[PDB]
Short mmCIF file of all heavy atoms in Angstrom, two decimals:
data_model
loop_
_atom_site.label_atom_id
_atom_site.label_comp_id
_atom_site.label_asym_id
_atom_site.label_seq_id
_atom_site.Cartn_x
_atom_site.Cartn_y
_atom_site.Cartn_z
N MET A 253 22.51 108.86 -16.03
CA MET A 253 21.64 109.55 -15.08
C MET A 253 20.28 109.82 -15.71
O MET A 253 19.25 109.77 -15.04
CB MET A 253 22.27 110.87 -14.63
CG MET A 253 21.46 111.63 -13.59
SD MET A 253 22.38 113.00 -12.84
CE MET A 253 22.23 114.26 -14.13
N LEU A 261 6.39 112.16 -22.97
CA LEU A 261 5.83 113.11 -22.02
C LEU A 261 6.85 114.15 -21.55
O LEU A 261 6.52 115.31 -21.33
CB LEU A 261 5.26 112.38 -20.81
CG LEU A 261 4.52 113.27 -19.82
CD1 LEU A 261 3.28 113.85 -20.50
CD2 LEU A 261 4.11 112.46 -18.59
N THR A 262 8.10 113.72 -21.41
CA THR A 262 9.15 114.61 -20.93
C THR A 262 10.18 115.06 -21.97
O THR A 262 10.85 116.07 -21.78
CB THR A 262 9.88 113.94 -19.77
OG1 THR A 262 10.41 112.70 -20.22
CG2 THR A 262 8.89 113.66 -18.62
N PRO A 264 11.55 116.95 -24.87
CA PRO A 264 11.22 118.22 -25.54
C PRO A 264 10.76 118.06 -26.99
O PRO A 264 9.67 118.52 -27.36
CB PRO A 264 12.52 119.02 -25.43
CG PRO A 264 13.11 118.50 -24.15
CD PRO A 264 12.90 117.01 -24.28
N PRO A 275 -5.86 118.19 -30.35
CA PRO A 275 -6.99 119.04 -30.73
C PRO A 275 -7.07 120.12 -29.65
O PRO A 275 -6.55 119.93 -28.54
CB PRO A 275 -8.17 118.08 -30.67
CG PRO A 275 -7.81 117.21 -29.52
CD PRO A 275 -6.35 116.91 -29.78
N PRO A 278 -11.14 118.27 -26.10
CA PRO A 278 -11.48 116.85 -26.27
C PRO A 278 -12.48 116.70 -27.41
O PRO A 278 -13.29 117.60 -27.65
CB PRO A 278 -12.07 116.47 -24.91
CG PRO A 278 -11.31 117.38 -23.95
CD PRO A 278 -11.30 118.70 -24.70
N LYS A 361 -7.66 94.68 -1.17
CA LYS A 361 -7.30 95.68 -0.17
C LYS A 361 -7.87 95.26 1.20
O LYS A 361 -7.16 95.22 2.20
CB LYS A 361 -7.86 97.05 -0.55
CG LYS A 361 -7.70 98.10 0.54
CD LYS A 361 -8.41 99.39 0.17
CE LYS A 361 -8.16 100.46 1.20
NZ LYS A 361 -6.70 100.76 1.34
N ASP A 362 -9.17 94.96 1.23
CA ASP A 362 -9.83 94.56 2.46
C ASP A 362 -9.23 93.30 3.05
O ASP A 362 -8.94 93.26 4.25
CB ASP A 362 -11.33 94.35 2.21
CG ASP A 362 -12.07 95.66 2.02
OD1 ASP A 362 -11.39 96.68 1.79
OD2 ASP A 362 -13.31 95.68 2.09
N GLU A 365 -5.71 93.96 4.58
CA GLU A 365 -5.75 94.63 5.88
C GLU A 365 -5.94 93.58 6.99
O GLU A 365 -5.32 93.65 8.05
CB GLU A 365 -6.90 95.63 5.95
CG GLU A 365 -6.91 96.70 4.87
CD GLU A 365 -8.15 97.59 4.96
OE1 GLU A 365 -9.23 97.06 5.28
OE2 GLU A 365 -8.05 98.81 4.69
N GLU A 366 -6.82 92.62 6.72
CA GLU A 366 -7.11 91.56 7.68
C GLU A 366 -5.89 90.67 7.88
O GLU A 366 -5.52 90.35 9.01
CB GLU A 366 -8.31 90.76 7.16
CG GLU A 366 -9.49 91.67 6.87
CD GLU A 366 -10.52 91.06 5.95
OE1 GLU A 366 -10.20 90.03 5.31
OE2 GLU A 366 -11.63 91.61 5.84
N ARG A 368 -2.67 91.41 7.44
CA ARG A 368 -1.65 92.11 8.22
C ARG A 368 -2.06 92.29 9.69
O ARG A 368 -1.22 92.17 10.59
CB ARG A 368 -1.32 93.47 7.59
CG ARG A 368 -0.80 93.38 6.15
CD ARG A 368 0.52 94.13 5.99
NE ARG A 368 0.46 95.44 6.62
CZ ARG A 368 1.48 96.03 7.22
NH1 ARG A 368 2.67 95.46 7.28
NH2 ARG A 368 1.30 97.20 7.80
N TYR A 369 -3.33 92.58 9.92
CA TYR A 369 -3.80 92.74 11.30
C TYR A 369 -3.67 91.39 11.99
O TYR A 369 -3.13 91.30 13.10
CB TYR A 369 -5.26 93.18 11.33
CG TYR A 369 -5.84 93.24 12.72
CD1 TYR A 369 -5.18 93.91 13.76
CD2 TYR A 369 -7.08 92.65 13.00
CE1 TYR A 369 -5.74 93.99 15.04
CE2 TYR A 369 -7.64 92.73 14.27
CZ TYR A 369 -6.97 93.40 15.28
OH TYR A 369 -7.55 93.49 16.53
N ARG A 372 -0.25 90.88 13.21
CA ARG A 372 -0.05 91.72 14.38
C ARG A 372 -0.71 91.09 15.61
O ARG A 372 -0.10 91.00 16.69
CB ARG A 372 -0.67 93.09 14.13
CG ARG A 372 0.30 94.24 14.19
CD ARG A 372 0.19 95.09 12.95
NE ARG A 372 -1.16 95.60 12.71
CZ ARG A 372 -1.61 95.92 11.50
NH1 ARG A 372 -0.82 95.78 10.45
NH2 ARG A 372 -2.85 96.39 11.35
N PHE A 373 -1.95 90.66 15.45
CA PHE A 373 -2.70 90.04 16.53
C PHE A 373 -1.99 88.80 17.08
O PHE A 373 -1.75 88.70 18.29
CB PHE A 373 -4.10 89.65 16.04
CG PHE A 373 -4.83 88.74 16.99
CD1 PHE A 373 -5.27 89.21 18.22
CD2 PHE A 373 -5.07 87.42 16.65
CE1 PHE A 373 -5.93 88.37 19.12
CE2 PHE A 373 -5.73 86.56 17.53
CZ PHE A 373 -6.16 87.04 18.77
N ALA A 379 2.72 87.14 22.70
CA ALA A 379 3.47 87.97 23.62
C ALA A 379 2.72 88.12 24.94
O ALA A 379 3.33 88.03 26.01
CB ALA A 379 3.72 89.36 23.00
N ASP A 380 1.41 88.33 24.84
CA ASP A 380 0.57 88.52 26.02
C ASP A 380 0.40 87.21 26.80
O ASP A 380 0.00 87.22 27.97
CB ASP A 380 -0.80 89.07 25.61
CG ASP A 380 -1.44 89.94 26.68
OD1 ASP A 380 -0.76 90.82 27.25
OD2 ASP A 380 -2.65 89.76 26.95
N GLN A 382 -1.85 84.93 26.45
CA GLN A 382 -3.25 84.60 26.71
C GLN A 382 -3.54 83.10 26.55
O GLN A 382 -4.60 82.62 26.97
CB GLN A 382 -4.19 85.38 25.76
CG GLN A 382 -4.38 86.84 26.13
CD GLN A 382 -5.38 87.57 25.24
OE1 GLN A 382 -6.51 87.10 25.04
NE2 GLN A 382 -4.98 88.72 24.70
N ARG A 384 -2.31 80.70 28.12
CA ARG A 384 -2.39 80.10 29.45
C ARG A 384 -3.83 79.78 29.87
O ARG A 384 -4.15 78.63 30.17
CB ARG A 384 -1.73 81.03 30.47
CG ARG A 384 -0.22 81.15 30.28
CD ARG A 384 0.38 82.23 31.16
NE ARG A 384 -0.03 83.57 30.76
CZ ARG A 384 0.47 84.69 31.27
NH1 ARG A 384 1.41 84.63 32.21
NH2 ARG A 384 0.06 85.87 30.83
N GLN A 508 -23.32 77.78 9.31
CA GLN A 508 -23.58 78.77 10.34
C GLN A 508 -23.64 78.12 11.72
O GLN A 508 -23.05 78.63 12.68
CB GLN A 508 -24.87 79.52 10.03
CG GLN A 508 -24.72 80.57 8.93
CD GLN A 508 -23.78 81.70 9.34
OE1 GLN A 508 -22.57 81.50 9.47
NE2 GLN A 508 -24.34 82.89 9.55
N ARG A 512 -21.02 79.50 14.08
CA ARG A 512 -21.63 80.42 15.04
C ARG A 512 -22.25 79.83 16.29
O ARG A 512 -22.32 80.51 17.32
CB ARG A 512 -22.70 81.27 14.33
CG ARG A 512 -23.28 82.39 15.17
CD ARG A 512 -24.43 83.07 14.46
NE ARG A 512 -25.65 82.26 14.51
CZ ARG A 512 -26.76 82.52 13.82
NH1 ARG A 512 -26.81 83.57 13.01
NH2 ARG A 512 -27.82 81.74 13.95
N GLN A 516 -18.12 79.44 17.99
CA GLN A 516 -18.28 80.86 18.28
C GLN A 516 -19.09 81.02 19.56
O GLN A 516 -19.43 82.14 19.98
CB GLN A 516 -18.99 81.58 17.12
CG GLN A 516 -19.20 83.08 17.32
CD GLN A 516 -17.90 83.87 17.29
OE1 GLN A 516 -16.98 83.59 18.05
NE2 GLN A 516 -17.82 84.86 16.40
N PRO A 520 -14.55 80.16 23.88
CA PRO A 520 -14.29 81.06 25.00
C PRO A 520 -14.39 80.35 26.36
O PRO A 520 -13.50 80.47 27.20
CB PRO A 520 -15.37 82.13 24.83
CG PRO A 520 -15.53 82.20 23.35
CD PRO A 520 -15.56 80.74 22.97
N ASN A 525 -9.81 82.73 23.08
CA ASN A 525 -10.23 83.89 22.31
C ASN A 525 -9.57 83.84 20.94
O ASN A 525 -9.89 84.63 20.05
CB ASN A 525 -9.85 85.19 23.03
CG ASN A 525 -10.92 85.65 24.01
OD1 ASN A 525 -12.07 85.88 23.63
ND2 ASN A 525 -10.53 85.78 25.28
N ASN A 532 -14.48 85.31 13.60
CA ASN A 532 -14.98 86.66 13.33
C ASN A 532 -14.79 86.95 11.84
O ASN A 532 -15.64 87.56 11.19
CB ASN A 532 -14.24 87.71 14.17
CG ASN A 532 -14.83 87.87 15.57
OD1 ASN A 532 -16.02 87.63 15.79
ND2 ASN A 532 -14.00 88.31 16.52
N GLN A 533 -13.66 86.49 11.30
CA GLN A 533 -13.38 86.69 9.89
C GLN A 533 -14.36 85.92 9.04
O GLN A 533 -15.06 86.51 8.20
CB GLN A 533 -11.95 86.25 9.57
CG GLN A 533 -10.91 87.16 10.21
CD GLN A 533 -9.51 86.76 9.83
OE1 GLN A 533 -9.30 86.11 8.82
NE2 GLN A 533 -8.54 87.17 10.64
N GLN A 535 -17.19 84.80 9.72
CA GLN A 535 -18.54 85.31 9.84
C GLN A 535 -18.70 86.62 9.10
O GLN A 535 -19.73 86.86 8.46
CB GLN A 535 -18.92 85.47 11.32
CG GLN A 535 -19.15 84.12 12.00
CD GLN A 535 -20.07 83.21 11.20
OE1 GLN A 535 -21.24 83.54 10.97
NE2 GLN A 535 -19.55 82.07 10.76
N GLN A 539 -21.40 87.06 6.03
CA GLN A 539 -22.37 88.14 5.86
C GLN A 539 -22.12 88.90 4.57
O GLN A 539 -23.06 89.33 3.91
CB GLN A 539 -22.31 89.10 7.05
CG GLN A 539 -22.78 88.48 8.35
CD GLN A 539 -24.14 87.83 8.23
OE1 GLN A 539 -25.07 88.40 7.65
NE2 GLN A 539 -24.27 86.62 8.78
N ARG A 608 -31.91 79.08 16.27
CA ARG A 608 -31.48 80.38 15.76
C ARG A 608 -31.10 80.28 14.29
O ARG A 608 -31.53 81.08 13.46
CB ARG A 608 -30.29 80.92 16.57
CG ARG A 608 -30.67 81.85 17.70
CD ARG A 608 -29.47 82.63 18.21
NE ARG A 608 -28.49 81.78 18.88
CZ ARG A 608 -28.65 81.27 20.10
NH1 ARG A 608 -29.75 81.53 20.79
NH2 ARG A 608 -27.70 80.50 20.63
N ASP A 612 -32.89 82.08 11.12
CA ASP A 612 -32.16 83.03 10.29
C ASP A 612 -32.24 82.56 8.84
O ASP A 612 -32.57 83.33 7.94
CB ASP A 612 -30.69 83.11 10.73
CG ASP A 612 -30.51 83.74 12.10
OD1 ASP A 612 -31.27 84.66 12.46
OD2 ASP A 612 -29.58 83.31 12.82
N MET D 229 -7.79 122.33 -22.08
CA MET D 229 -7.38 120.93 -22.00
C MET D 229 -5.93 120.82 -21.54
O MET D 229 -5.60 119.94 -20.75
CB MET D 229 -7.57 120.25 -23.37
CG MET D 229 -7.47 118.74 -23.34
SD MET D 229 -7.75 118.02 -24.97
CE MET D 229 -6.25 118.46 -25.81
N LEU D 237 8.96 119.82 -16.09
CA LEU D 237 9.21 118.43 -16.44
C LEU D 237 8.61 118.03 -17.79
O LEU D 237 9.11 117.15 -18.46
CB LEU D 237 8.65 117.52 -15.35
CG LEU D 237 8.94 116.02 -15.48
CD1 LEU D 237 10.44 115.75 -15.32
CD2 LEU D 237 8.16 115.27 -14.40
N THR D 238 7.54 118.70 -18.19
CA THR D 238 6.87 118.34 -19.43
C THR D 238 6.85 119.39 -20.52
O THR D 238 6.49 119.08 -21.65
CB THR D 238 5.42 117.95 -19.16
OG1 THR D 238 4.78 119.03 -18.47
CG2 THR D 238 5.36 116.69 -18.33
N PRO D 240 8.38 121.43 -23.28
CA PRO D 240 9.53 121.36 -24.19
C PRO D 240 10.60 122.43 -24.00
O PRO D 240 11.77 122.09 -23.80
CB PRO D 240 8.86 121.42 -25.57
CG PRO D 240 7.58 120.65 -25.32
CD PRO D 240 7.12 121.23 -24.00
N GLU D 244 14.07 121.61 -21.83
CA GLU D 244 15.32 121.63 -22.57
C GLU D 244 16.34 122.50 -21.86
O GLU D 244 17.52 122.15 -21.78
CB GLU D 244 15.10 122.09 -24.00
CG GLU D 244 16.26 121.71 -24.93
CD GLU D 244 16.93 120.39 -24.53
OE1 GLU D 244 17.83 120.43 -23.66
OE2 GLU D 244 16.56 119.32 -25.09
N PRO D 251 24.28 118.06 -14.77
CA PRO D 251 25.64 117.52 -14.78
C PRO D 251 25.54 116.18 -15.51
O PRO D 251 24.44 115.66 -15.68
CB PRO D 251 25.94 117.35 -13.30
CG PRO D 251 24.60 116.99 -12.73
CD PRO D 251 23.70 118.01 -13.41
N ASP D 338 -1.27 100.91 9.62
CA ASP D 338 -1.75 99.79 10.43
C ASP D 338 -3.02 100.18 11.18
O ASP D 338 -3.97 99.41 11.28
CB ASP D 338 -0.68 99.35 11.43
CG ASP D 338 0.56 98.78 10.76
OD1 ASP D 338 0.63 98.82 9.52
OD2 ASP D 338 1.46 98.30 11.48
N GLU D 341 -5.85 100.17 8.83
CA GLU D 341 -6.29 98.82 8.50
C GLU D 341 -7.24 98.33 9.59
O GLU D 341 -8.32 97.84 9.32
CB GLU D 341 -5.10 97.85 8.43
CG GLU D 341 -4.00 98.30 7.49
CD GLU D 341 -2.87 97.29 7.38
OE1 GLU D 341 -2.50 96.70 8.42
OE2 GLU D 341 -2.36 97.10 6.26
N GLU D 342 -6.79 98.48 10.84
CA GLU D 342 -7.57 98.09 12.00
C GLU D 342 -8.92 98.81 12.05
O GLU D 342 -9.92 98.23 12.44
CB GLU D 342 -6.75 98.39 13.26
CG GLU D 342 -5.66 97.37 13.52
CD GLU D 342 -4.42 97.98 14.14
OE1 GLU D 342 -4.53 99.06 14.77
OE2 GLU D 342 -3.34 97.36 14.02
N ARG D 344 -10.75 100.10 9.39
CA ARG D 344 -11.65 99.59 8.36
C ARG D 344 -12.12 98.17 8.68
O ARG D 344 -13.26 97.81 8.40
CB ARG D 344 -10.98 99.64 6.98
CG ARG D 344 -10.51 101.05 6.57
CD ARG D 344 -10.86 101.40 5.11
NE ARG D 344 -10.42 100.34 4.21
CZ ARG D 344 -11.16 99.82 3.23
NH1 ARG D 344 -12.39 100.28 2.99
NH2 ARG D 344 -10.68 98.81 2.52
N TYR D 345 -11.25 97.35 9.26
CA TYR D 345 -11.65 96.01 9.61
C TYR D 345 -12.68 96.07 10.74
O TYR D 345 -13.68 95.36 10.72
CB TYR D 345 -10.44 95.18 10.03
CG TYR D 345 -10.81 93.79 10.50
CD1 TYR D 345 -11.66 92.97 9.75
CD2 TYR D 345 -10.33 93.30 11.71
CE1 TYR D 345 -12.02 91.71 10.19
CE2 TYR D 345 -10.68 92.03 12.16
CZ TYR D 345 -11.53 91.24 11.40
OH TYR D 345 -11.87 89.99 11.86
N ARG D 348 -15.92 96.65 9.35
CA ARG D 348 -16.40 95.44 8.69
C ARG D 348 -16.87 94.45 9.75
O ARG D 348 -17.94 93.85 9.63
CB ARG D 348 -15.29 94.81 7.85
CG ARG D 348 -15.56 94.77 6.35
CD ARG D 348 -14.40 95.37 5.58
NE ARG D 348 -13.13 94.70 5.86
CZ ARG D 348 -11.95 95.32 5.80
NH1 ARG D 348 -11.91 96.60 5.48
NH2 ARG D 348 -10.83 94.67 6.06
N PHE D 349 -16.07 94.27 10.79
CA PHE D 349 -16.43 93.36 11.86
C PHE D 349 -17.77 93.75 12.50
O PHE D 349 -18.65 92.91 12.66
CB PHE D 349 -15.37 93.34 12.95
CG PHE D 349 -15.81 92.65 14.22
CD1 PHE D 349 -16.03 91.28 14.23
CD2 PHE D 349 -16.04 93.37 15.38
CE1 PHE D 349 -16.47 90.63 15.40
CE2 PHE D 349 -16.47 92.74 16.55
CZ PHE D 349 -16.69 91.37 16.56
N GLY D 352 -20.53 92.77 10.26
CA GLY D 352 -20.78 91.35 10.20
C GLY D 352 -21.42 90.90 11.50
O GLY D 352 -22.32 90.04 11.51
N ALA D 355 -25.15 92.00 11.67
CA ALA D 355 -25.90 91.20 10.70
C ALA D 355 -25.98 89.73 11.13
O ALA D 355 -26.95 89.04 10.81
CB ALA D 355 -25.26 91.30 9.31
N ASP D 356 -24.97 89.26 11.85
CA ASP D 356 -24.96 87.88 12.30
C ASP D 356 -25.88 87.71 13.52
O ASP D 356 -26.17 86.59 13.94
CB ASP D 356 -23.53 87.45 12.65
CG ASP D 356 -23.31 85.94 12.50
OD1 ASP D 356 -23.60 85.40 11.41
OD2 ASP D 356 -22.83 85.30 13.45
N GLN D 358 -25.37 88.10 16.62
CA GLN D 358 -24.73 87.49 17.78
C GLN D 358 -25.06 88.16 19.11
O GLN D 358 -24.93 87.54 20.17
CB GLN D 358 -23.21 87.46 17.57
CG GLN D 358 -22.78 86.77 16.27
CD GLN D 358 -21.27 86.65 16.15
OE1 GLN D 358 -20.60 86.11 17.03
NE2 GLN D 358 -20.72 87.15 15.04
N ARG D 360 -27.69 88.62 20.40
CA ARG D 360 -28.78 87.89 21.03
C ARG D 360 -28.36 86.98 22.18
O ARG D 360 -29.07 86.88 23.18
CB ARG D 360 -29.52 87.05 19.98
CG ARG D 360 -30.19 87.87 18.91
CD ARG D 360 -30.73 86.98 17.80
NE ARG D 360 -29.72 86.08 17.25
CZ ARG D 360 -29.82 85.47 16.08
NH1 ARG D 360 -30.89 85.66 15.32
NH2 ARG D 360 -28.86 84.66 15.66
N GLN D 484 -3.06 95.67 32.70
CA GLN D 484 -3.04 94.30 32.23
C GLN D 484 -4.07 93.42 32.98
O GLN D 484 -4.69 92.54 32.39
CB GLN D 484 -1.63 93.71 32.38
CG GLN D 484 -0.67 94.14 31.26
CD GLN D 484 -1.11 93.65 29.89
OE1 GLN D 484 -1.98 94.24 29.26
NE2 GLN D 484 -0.51 92.56 29.45
N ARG D 488 -7.08 92.12 30.54
CA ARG D 488 -6.95 90.70 30.30
C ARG D 488 -7.52 89.76 31.35
O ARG D 488 -8.22 88.81 31.00
CB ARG D 488 -5.48 90.34 30.08
CG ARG D 488 -5.28 88.92 29.61
CD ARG D 488 -3.82 88.59 29.55
NE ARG D 488 -3.29 88.35 30.88
CZ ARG D 488 -2.05 88.66 31.26
NH1 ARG D 488 -1.22 89.23 30.39
NH2 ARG D 488 -1.64 88.36 32.49
N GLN D 492 -11.41 90.48 29.44
CA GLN D 492 -11.08 89.48 28.43
C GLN D 492 -11.41 88.09 28.96
O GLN D 492 -12.02 87.27 28.27
CB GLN D 492 -9.59 89.57 28.09
CG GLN D 492 -9.12 88.58 27.04
CD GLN D 492 -9.04 89.18 25.65
OE1 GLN D 492 -10.02 89.75 25.14
NE2 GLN D 492 -7.88 89.05 25.02
N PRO D 496 -16.20 86.38 27.61
CA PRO D 496 -16.59 85.16 26.91
C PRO D 496 -17.63 84.33 27.66
O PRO D 496 -18.54 83.77 27.05
CB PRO D 496 -15.26 84.43 26.77
CG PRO D 496 -14.31 85.55 26.54
CD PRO D 496 -14.74 86.54 27.61
N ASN D 501 -18.59 88.35 22.70
CA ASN D 501 -17.46 88.20 21.80
C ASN D 501 -17.15 89.58 21.24
O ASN D 501 -16.17 89.77 20.51
CB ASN D 501 -17.78 87.27 20.64
CG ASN D 501 -17.82 85.82 21.05
OD1 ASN D 501 -16.90 85.32 21.71
ND2 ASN D 501 -18.87 85.11 20.63
N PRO D 504 -14.15 91.38 23.61
CA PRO D 504 -12.84 90.78 23.36
C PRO D 504 -12.23 91.23 22.03
O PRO D 504 -11.01 91.28 21.88
CB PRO D 504 -13.14 89.28 23.39
CG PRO D 504 -14.26 89.19 24.38
CD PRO D 504 -15.14 90.36 23.98
N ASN D 508 -8.53 92.77 22.01
CA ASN D 508 -7.43 92.21 21.24
C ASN D 508 -6.62 93.39 20.71
O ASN D 508 -5.40 93.35 20.66
CB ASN D 508 -7.93 91.37 20.05
CG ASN D 508 -8.45 90.00 20.46
OD1 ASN D 508 -8.01 89.44 21.47
ND2 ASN D 508 -9.36 89.45 19.66
N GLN D 509 -7.33 94.45 20.31
CA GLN D 509 -6.66 95.65 19.81
C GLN D 509 -5.81 96.27 20.90
O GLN D 509 -4.61 96.52 20.70
CB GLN D 509 -7.69 96.68 19.31
CG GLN D 509 -8.22 96.38 17.93
CD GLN D 509 -9.25 97.38 17.47
OE1 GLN D 509 -9.09 98.59 17.65
NE2 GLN D 509 -10.32 96.89 16.85
N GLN D 511 -4.66 94.92 23.60
CA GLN D 511 -3.54 94.08 23.98
C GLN D 511 -2.44 94.09 22.92
O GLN D 511 -1.26 94.07 23.24
CB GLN D 511 -4.03 92.66 24.28
CG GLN D 511 -4.96 92.64 25.51
CD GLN D 511 -4.37 93.39 26.72
OE1 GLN D 511 -3.45 92.90 27.39
NE2 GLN D 511 -4.88 94.59 26.98
N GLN D 515 1.30 95.36 23.80
CA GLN D 515 2.51 94.62 23.47
C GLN D 515 3.44 95.38 22.52
O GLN D 515 4.65 95.21 22.57
CB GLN D 515 2.15 93.26 22.88
CG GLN D 515 1.58 92.29 23.92
CD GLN D 515 2.52 92.05 25.10
OE1 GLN D 515 3.74 91.94 24.94
NE2 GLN D 515 1.95 91.95 26.29
N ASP D 588 4.24 88.22 35.19
CA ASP D 588 4.63 88.78 33.90
C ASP D 588 5.36 90.10 34.11
O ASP D 588 6.33 90.41 33.41
CB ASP D 588 3.42 89.05 33.01
CG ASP D 588 2.76 87.79 32.53
OD1 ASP D 588 3.34 86.70 32.71
OD2 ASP D 588 1.66 87.90 31.96
#
Side-chain angles (χ1 to χ4, degrees):
Chain A
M253 182 168 80
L261 186 65
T262 58
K361 172 186 185 59
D362 287 15
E365 304 176 323
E366 306 161 346
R368 301 233 314 146
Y369 175 50
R372 240 128 56 206
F373 168 68
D380 210 47
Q382 284 184 51
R384 293 172 291 188
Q508 283 296 69
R512 188 187 77 189
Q516 180 68 304
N525 272 301
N532 275 332
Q533 291 183 23
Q535 288 311 298
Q539 293 308 315
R608 265 196 292 285
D612 292 324
Chain D
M229 192 178 72
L237 186 67
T238 55
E244 198 32 275
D338 295 5
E341 306 183 320
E342 283 146 22
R344 303 224 309 134
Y345 176 49
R348 243 128 57 210
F349 168 68
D356 207 53
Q358 305 185 55
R360 297 172 307 198
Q484 281 297 80
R488 189 186 77 213
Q492 180 98 306
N501 286 311
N508 284 332
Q509 280 179 43
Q511 295 311 285
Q515 289 303 320
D588 291 349

